[PDB]
Design a protein around this ligand. Structure first.
Ligand SMILES: NC[C@@H]1O[C@H](O[C@H]2[C@@H](O)[C@H](O[C@@H]3[C@@H](O)[C@H](N)C[C@H](N)[C@H]3O[C@H]3O[C@H](CO)[C@@H](O)[C@H](O)[C@H]3N)O[C@@H]2CO)[C@H](N)[C@@H](O)[C@@H]1O
Ligand SMILES: NC[C@@H]1O[C@H](O[C@H]2[C@@H](O)[C@H](O[C@@H]3[C@@H](O)[C@H](N)C[C@H](N)[C@H]3O[C@H]3O[C@H](CO)[C@@H](O)[C@H](O)[C@H]3N)O[C@@H]2CO)[C@H](N)[C@@H](O)[C@@H]1O
Ligand SMILES: [Mg+2]
Ligand SMILES: [Mg+2]
Ligand SMILES: [Mg+2]
Ligand SMILES: [Mg+2]
Ligand SMILES: [Mg+2]
Ligand SMILES: [Mg+2]
Ligand SMILES: [Mg+2]
Ligand SMILES: [Mg+2]
Ligand SMILES: [Mg+2]
Ligand SMILES: [Mg+2]
Ligand SMILES: [Mg+2]
Ligand SMILES: [Mg+2]
Ligand SMILES: [Mg+2]
Ligand SMILES: [Mg+2]
Ligand SMILES: [Mg+2]
Ligand SMILES: [Mg+2]
Ligand SMILES: [Mg+2]
Ligand SMILES: [Mg+2]
Ligand SMILES: [Mg+2]
Ligand SMILES: [Mg+2]
Ligand SMILES: [Mg+2]
Ligand SMILES: [Mg+2]
Ligand SMILES: [Mg+2]
Ligand SMILES: [Mg+2]
Ligand SMILES: [Mg+2]
Ligand SMILES: [Mg+2]
Ligand SMILES: [Mg+2]
Ligand SMILES: [Mg+2]
Ligand SMILES: [Mg+2]
Ligand SMILES: [Mg+2]
Ligand SMILES: [Mg+2]
Ligand SMILES: [Mg+2]
Ligand SMILES: [Mg+2]
Ligand SMILES: [Mg+2]
Ligand SMILES: [Mg+2]
Ligand SMILES: [Mg+2]
Ligand SMILES: [Mg+2]
Ligand SMILES: [Mg+2]
Ligand SMILES: [Mg+2]
Ligand SMILES: [Mg+2]
Ligand SMILES: [Mg+2]
Ligand SMILES: [Mg+2]
Ligand SMILES: [Mg+2]
Ligand SMILES: [Mg+2]
Ligand SMILES: [Mg+2]
Ligand SMILES: [Mg+2]
Ligand SMILES: [Mg+2]
Ligand SMILES: [Mg+2]
Ligand SMILES: [Mg+2]
Ligand SMILES: [Mg+2]
Ligand SMILES: [Mg+2]
Ligand SMILES: [Mg+2]
Ligand SMILES: [Mg+2]
Ligand SMILES: [Mg+2]
Ligand SMILES: [Mg+2]
Ligand SMILES: [Mg+2]
Ligand SMILES: [Mg+2]
Ligand SMILES: [Mg+2]
Ligand SMILES: [Mg+2]
Ligand SMILES: [Mg+2]
Ligand SMILES: [Mg+2]
Ligand SMILES: [Mg+2]
Ligand SMILES: [Mg+2]
Ligand SMILES: [Mg+2]
Ligand SMILES: [Mg+2]
Ligand SMILES: [Mg+2]
Ligand SMILES: [Mg+2]
Ligand SMILES: [Mg+2]
Ligand SMILES: [Mg+2]
Ligand SMILES: [Mg+2]
Ligand SMILES: [Mg+2]
Ligand SMILES: [Mg+2]
Ligand SMILES: [Mg+2]
Ligand SMILES: [Mg+2]
Ligand SMILES: [Mg+2]
Ligand SMILES: [Mg+2]
Ligand SMILES: [Mg+2]
Ligand SMILES: [Mg+2]
Ligand SMILES: [Mg+2]
Ligand SMILES: [Mg+2]
Ligand SMILES: [Mg+2]
Ligand SMILES: [Mg+2]
Ligand SMILES: [Mg+2]
Ligand SMILES: [Mg+2]
Ligand SMILES: [Mg+2]
Ligand SMILES: [Mg+2]
Ligand SMILES: [Mg+2]
Ligand SMILES: [Mg+2]
Ligand SMILES: [Mg+2]
Ligand SMILES: [Mg+2]
Ligand SMILES: [Mg+2]
Ligand SMILES: [Mg+2]
Ligand SMILES: [Mg+2]
Ligand SMILES: [Mg+2]
Ligand SMILES: [Mg+2]
Lengths: 157, 127, 106, 197, 113, 48
RNA sequence: GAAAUUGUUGAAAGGGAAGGGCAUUUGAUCAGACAUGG
RNA sequence: GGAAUACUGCCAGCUGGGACUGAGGACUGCGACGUAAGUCAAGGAUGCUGGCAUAAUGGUUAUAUGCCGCCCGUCUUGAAA
RNA sequence: GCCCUGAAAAUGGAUGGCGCUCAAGCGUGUUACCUAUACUCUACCGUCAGGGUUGAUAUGAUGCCCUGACGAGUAGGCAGGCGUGGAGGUCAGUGACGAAGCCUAGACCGUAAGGUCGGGUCGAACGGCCUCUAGUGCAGAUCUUGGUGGUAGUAGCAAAUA
RNA sequence: UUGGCGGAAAGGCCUUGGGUGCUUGCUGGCGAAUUGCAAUGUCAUUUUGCGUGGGGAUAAAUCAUUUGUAUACGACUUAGA
């Protein structure tokens, strides 16, 4: 014997977790985000882009278009905390949005012909509305940027 | 492969080297408490070396656990190894330095077959 | 376009300190345009990044970034306290830092 | 904001200009001070003179060569006040002082560059009327600064060219607002003022 | 010299007992998380609520000695927002703190809670 | 006081050229040789 | 075949000593964590 | 003469931003919302998504930087002396 | 009241330092703000106290578990431990397939004394636990002996005619 | 590419002349996705080494020797194709 054997040793039984009480409640959203509201993406691939909020999804993200034919952004999840909500909005009355949901984006490359139509569908409603108020196409077509003197605790958006 | 345990928190990783063992070679770093009357270390003036005291003691739950999570057990032979058969998810086996290379292939073989972790495999091991 | 900046310019001023003793675990940051603790409350919680260069590569690039969040407000002039995953090198005093717009409550 | 800030020393107050410049450097702002000879110091010339002579009094007894060094020129009289407000015996401070330049007169790179003013160090804004104040260059010359007239001679020459530059510049802004007339009444005009421009 | 004091309001007592209220059971500083704790101890006097304790304190009354003694002394933080003075150890009438500030004890104690 | 330019005469006495050399006897005495071309070009560089 | 001490080689630092504490950049160096259908 | 307003104070009034913490580990307690089935924020963090193995991350070590740090031992009222 | 005179000392010099004149001075008021090893909240180590519990079903009743408070320290006391030579007992312990020692800006464990491992060098002995026992732990004592430095290729190697 | 002006550290400023690229002043037609809900990002700017393609140029200094206007030793100052 090198070391002497312990008098005890513990149990290798894993212990059961205590029963936790935390409900998962629905997420309150910032008053500023009402579907149809243009958005500013602050991070990620598409940062700098000006987009259009579509639906609050149930994984807590935000449905988005912008739409593709203008700024190149497809129908997309985005996180509410990485967005600035600008005070300009488009009328969303004519957009379906019902099909689009959590498992729609479920990870199952070649872009599924399903999606490629859906964008043509959804954006066909948007642009027709975006066309209704002058220069809005140019607006969503541009990228947001901070310029010398811009103070975000002042600037209204 | 081991009991889950909370994050190990070491609380002081540095070594508590004896005062001035940096200064005079004759002074070994093995910690020694300064008994002197004026000693700035003993009186704890700001800027000096921090001394070992009990507040630094490890959490009774994460104490003695190696980074793996196995409190390790010294094993000189296959009989020693086999003390760990039931406690495989608790302890770990450390072959003694003096065990020859033959019994190391032997102890490793039983430890594998028994499902016991050897802390120091690749021990005296050729090629 | 001609300007891609999504962040507010900043400066790493000092650690948190008393007269004779500092605390590297917190950093004091000056933000452009923020002159009062009123204004600095907007940037409370925001993400900061210190951006620096190196020799070796991480992925294909010699550029690396230290990340931290704006924590509270400092004094009457609109300075802000901050804490980074790892403390800033303290050579970094007087070096630019980047205060982003996220997490956004706008 | 701006990579480098040129400050016109004229009509400023030494200790208060030094105080604001020091923080800039410690905070990373590159600075250059021009026309340091037109800088001011509160107190009448005799005082701020005698004050210098006390400074002049102190030198290392056994070797005047290692003692405190008494720099006469206004830029240096200024730099001392500034370097005294920076922790200069450490690496940080050394670096910060490297961010600073000081010149008497206004030498060529900066002579065509835009120069600003530091209101809380400005004399007229700060000092009460009737209080007497010293002009640095004149004091600097009484303690042995040798370059005053040359600086002035070149300053007068520079002021000529700067005058003519400004003459062209203004006359163009005339011809810019002249041709601006029709658009001042244009439709894009009313478009712009609607939003404030 | 060593204390500031005065006359506490209902709130001040209520919020002091609700947040910081503890009680003494065989040494053992015990938080009052349940009236059962109170009743188990102050019950022989009446006082089975936590507001029964509060009442027996503010109204003073017959068992105030033991109702107050039951209460562990209140551990408080420094005043949030400062002490209002430069220097504490001048009397309230002169320089602030250190004395009987009467009704002004409430603004202070509440900020120390 | 600062020195702006210096202009040398076309031909320098060997006594001067001797001053520019530590070891004159073994030097190839390249002297002002390329500088004298400034005259040989008619004018200009000396006159300017 | 230890230490003081010394040679060479390699690495690093160095504006009137050097060594120490906290923290972090940089480099060097070590690690614990990878078996579930092919 | 009828208000308003300031000032001080109370509400077991409603709401927005930031920060640190998640100790415990089946159930036992006290509760609240319930017509009920039951639900909860009620005796301590869970849900969701992503990112990492040429490696993220963590230890050591050298160097740098901010702040700090006088030579121990001894006698002594008092030692860096 | 503030200021001025009164108001003379020896290295150059100190409102701490720059420097400040409707102050960055003096008297007074009012607010915001900065940060102690202190206060409040929580995690962790220890100490002391109180309570539960082998009715059990293994592997410790000196335990296991719940709760509250506390933590400065010289001289000094006590406790719980670390380490060395030898001794009884035991692992039928380790080892020429490499014991001990030594070297390792390599690994792990312990608050610490210390313990453990890899690699190198090595050559014949050696370790764990339970006890016993001491010629049992060093930085000093102008300590003892032995060895080695800086000083330093320096002082010097110039009387006595060559 | 033509001229001017600039010596405070001018090393920059004004100008002619054509050539050529873009232009969001304005009107069209296409593309962007899956980088998957943020971590990833534009490459700046210093020195230095390999290289290739042509342009241009072809020295001294130290040692030893030597002088004494110099000199403790270095140093100084002369001389030698
Ligand atoms: N003391 C334990 C050891 O200390 C070491 O560090 C210390 C000493 O042991 C070691 O001694 C150095 C030595 O490195 C070096 N190669 C030679 C040098 N002479 C010694 O140091 C000595 O030198 C000076 C004169 O130069 C003496 O005046 C003085 O006594 C001492 N500093 O240098 C450090 C300062 O002297 C290491 N940290 C390590 O090996 C171990 O911790
Ligand atoms: N900053 C210097 C100020 O003077 C104080 O110190 C002053 C005193 O020590 C000293 O005063 C001395 C006096 O003691 C002794 N008799 C010698 C000398 N002639 C006097 O000096 C005085 O001269 C006259 C009054 O006599 C005053 O006008 C003058 O200000 C004062 N310095 O003169 C010093 C300088 O004025 C302190 N150093 C400091 O707290 C204060 O701010
Ligand atoms: Mg529970
Ligand atoms: Mg529940
Ligand atoms: Mg740490
Ligand atoms: Mg340790
Ligand atoms: Mg330490
Ligand atoms: Mg050791
Ligand atoms: Mg003492
Ligand atoms: Mg070993
Ligand atoms: Mg941290
Ligand atoms: Mg830390
Ligand atoms: Mg958060
Ligand atoms: Mg870290
Ligand atoms: Mg940490
Ligand atoms: Mg002066
Ligand atoms: Mg200073
Ligand atoms: Mg220095
Ligand atoms: Mg200069
Ligand atoms: Mg002179
Ligand atoms: Mg003189
Ligand atoms: Mg506050
Ligand atoms: Mg105070
Ligand atoms: Mg004050
Ligand atoms: Mg409060
Ligand atoms: Mg409070
Ligand atoms: Mg000629
Ligand atoms: Mg050896
Ligand atoms: Mg050695
Ligand atoms: Mg070496
Ligand atoms: Mg030197
Ligand atoms: Mg030296
Ligand atoms: Mg030092
Ligand atoms: Mg009436
Ligand atoms: Mg009435
Ligand atoms: Mg009110
Ligand atoms: Mg309600
Ligand atoms: Mg837990
Ligand atoms: Mg219930
Ligand atoms: Mg009900
Ligand atoms: Mg009911
Ligand atoms: Mg029920
Ligand atoms: Mg719970
Ligand atoms: Mg996951
Ligand atoms: Mg490191
Ligand atoms: Mg110091
Ligand atoms: Mg003594
Ligand atoms: Mg004595
Ligand atoms: Mg005495
Ligand atoms: Mg004594
Ligand atoms: Mg006496
Ligand atoms: Mg002493
Ligand atoms: Mg005196
Ligand atoms: Mg003074
Ligand atoms: Mg003071
Ligand atoms: Mg002055
Ligand atoms: Mg002065
Ligand atoms: Mg001050
Ligand atoms: Mg005042
Ligand atoms: Mg204020
Ligand atoms: Mg603490
Ligand atoms: Mg007990
Ligand atoms: Mg104690
Ligand atoms: Mg005590
Ligand atoms: Mg003690
Ligand atoms: Mg003692
Ligand atoms: Mg112990
Ligand atoms: Mg023994
Ligand atoms: Mg013996
Ligand atoms: Mg024996
Ligand atoms: Mg034995
Ligand atoms: Mg054997
Ligand atoms: Mg041994
Ligand atoms: Mg080591
Ligand atoms: Mg080996
Ligand atoms: Mg060897
Ligand atoms: Mg061996
Ligand atoms: Mg032998
Ligand atoms: Mg043998
Ligand atoms: Mg032992
Ligand atoms: Mg002995
Ligand atoms: Mg010994
Ligand atoms: Mg010794
Ligand atoms: Mg000694
Ligand atoms: Mg010797
Ligand atoms: Mg030496
Ligand atoms: Mg010799
Ligand atoms: Mg000799
Ligand atoms: Mg002699
Ligand atoms: Mg002789
Ligand atoms: Mg320049
Ligand atoms: Mg040029
Ligand atoms: Mg040139
Ligand atoms: Mg053109
Ligand atoms: Mg001679
Ligand atoms: Mg002679
Ligand atoms: Mg000679």
């Amino acid at each position: 014997s090198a070391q002497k054997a312990p008098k005890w040793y513990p149990s290798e039984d894993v212990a059961a977790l205590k029963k936790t009480r935390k409900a998962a409640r629905p997420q309150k959203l910032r008053a500023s985000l009402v579907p149809g509201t243009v958005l500013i993406l602050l991070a990620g691939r598409f940062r700098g882009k000006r987009v259009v909020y579509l639906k609050h999804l149930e994984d807590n993200t935000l449905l988005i278009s912008g739409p593709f034919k203008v700024n190149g952004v497809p129908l997309r999840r985005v996180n509410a905390r990485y967005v600035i909500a600008t005070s300009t909005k488009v009328s969303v009355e004519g957009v379906n949005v019902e099909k689009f949901n959590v498992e729609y984006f479920a990870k199952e490359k070649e872009i599924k012909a399903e999606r490629v139509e859906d964008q043509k569908v959804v954006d066909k409603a948007l642009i027709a509305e975006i066309k209704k108020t002058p220069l809005l196409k140019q607006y969503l077509s541009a990228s947001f940027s901070l310029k010398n003197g811009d103070k975000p605790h002042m600037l209204k958006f | 492969a081991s009991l889950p345990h909370p994050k190990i928190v070491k609380k002081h990783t540095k070594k508590f080297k004896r005062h001035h063992s940096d200064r005079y070679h004759r002074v070994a770093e093995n910690w020694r408490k300064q008994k002197g009357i004026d000693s700035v270390v003993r009186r704890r003036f700001r800027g000096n070396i921090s001394q070992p005291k009990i507040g630094y003691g490890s959490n009774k739950k994460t104490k003695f656990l190696s980074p793996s999570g196995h409190k390790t057990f010294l094993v000189a032979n296959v009989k020693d190894l086999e003390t760990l058969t039931m406690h495989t998810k608790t302890y770990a086996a450390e072959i003694a330095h003096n065990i020859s290379a033959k019994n190391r292939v032997v102890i490793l073989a039983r430890a594998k077959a028994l499902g016991i972790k050897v802390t120091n495999p690749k021990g005296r091991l050729a090629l | 376009a001609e300007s891609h900046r999504l962040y507010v310019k900043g400066k790493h001023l000092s650690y948190q300190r008393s007269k004779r003793v500092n605390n590297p675990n917190v950093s004091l940051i000056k933000i452009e345009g923020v002159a009062t603790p009123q204004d600095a409350q907007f940037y409370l919680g925001k993400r900061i990044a210190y951006v620096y260069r190196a020799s070796k590569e991480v992925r294909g690039s010699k550029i690396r970034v230290m990340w931290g969040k704006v924590t509270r407000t400092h004094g009457n002039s609109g300075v802000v306290r901050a804490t980074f995953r790892n403390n800033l090198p303290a050579k970094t005093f007087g070096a630019s830092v980047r205060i982003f717009l996220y997490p956004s409550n706008i | 904001v701006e990579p480098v800030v040129v400050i016109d020393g004229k009509g400023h107050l030494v200790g208060r200009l030094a105080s604001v410049v020091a923080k800039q450097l410690l905070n990373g702002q590159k600075i250059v001070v021009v026309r340091a000879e037109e800088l001011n110091i509160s107190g009448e010339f005799f005082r701020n003179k005698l004050k210098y002579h006390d400074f002049l009094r102190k030198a290392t007894a056994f070797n005047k060569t290692r003692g405190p060094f008494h720099f006469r020129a206004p830029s240096r009289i200024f730099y001392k006040a500034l370097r005294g407000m920076v922790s200069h015996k450490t690496a940080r401070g050394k670096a910060a002082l490297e961010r600073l330049k000081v010149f008497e007169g206004i030498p060529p790179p900066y002579d065509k560059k835009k120069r600003v003013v530091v209101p809380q160090a400005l004399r007229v804004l700060r000092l009460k009327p009737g209080r007497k104040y010293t002009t640095l260059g004149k004091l600097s010359t009484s303690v042995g600064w040798k370059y005053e007239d040359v600086v002035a001679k070149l300053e007068a020459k520079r002021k000529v060219s700067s005058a003519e530059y400004y003459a062209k510049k203004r006359a163009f802004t005339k011809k810019v607002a002249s041709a601006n007339a029709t658009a001042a009444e244009s439709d894009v005009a009313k478009q712009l003022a609607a939003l404030g421009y | 010299p060593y204390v500031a004091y005065g006359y506490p309001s209902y709130s001040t007592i209520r919020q002091l007992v609700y947040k910081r209220g503890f009680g003494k059971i065989n040494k053992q500083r015990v938080p009052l998380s349940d009236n059962a704790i109170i009743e188990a101890n102050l019950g022989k006097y009446g006082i089975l609520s936590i507001d029964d304790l509060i009442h027996e304190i503010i109204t003073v009354g017959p068992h105030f000695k033991q109702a107050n003694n039951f209460l562990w002394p209140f551990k408080l933080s420094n005043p949030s927002g400062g002490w209002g003075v430069p220097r504490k150890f001048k009397h309230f009438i002169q320089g602030g703190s250190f004395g009987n500030r009467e009704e002004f004890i409430n603004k202070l104690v509440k900020s120390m809670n | 006081l600062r020195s702006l330019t210096t202009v040398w005469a076309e031909h320098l006495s060997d006594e001067v050229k001797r001053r520019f050399y530590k070891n004159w006897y073994k030097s190839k005495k390249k002297a002002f040789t390329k500088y004298s071309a400034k005259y040989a070009q008619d004018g200009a560089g000396i006159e300017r």
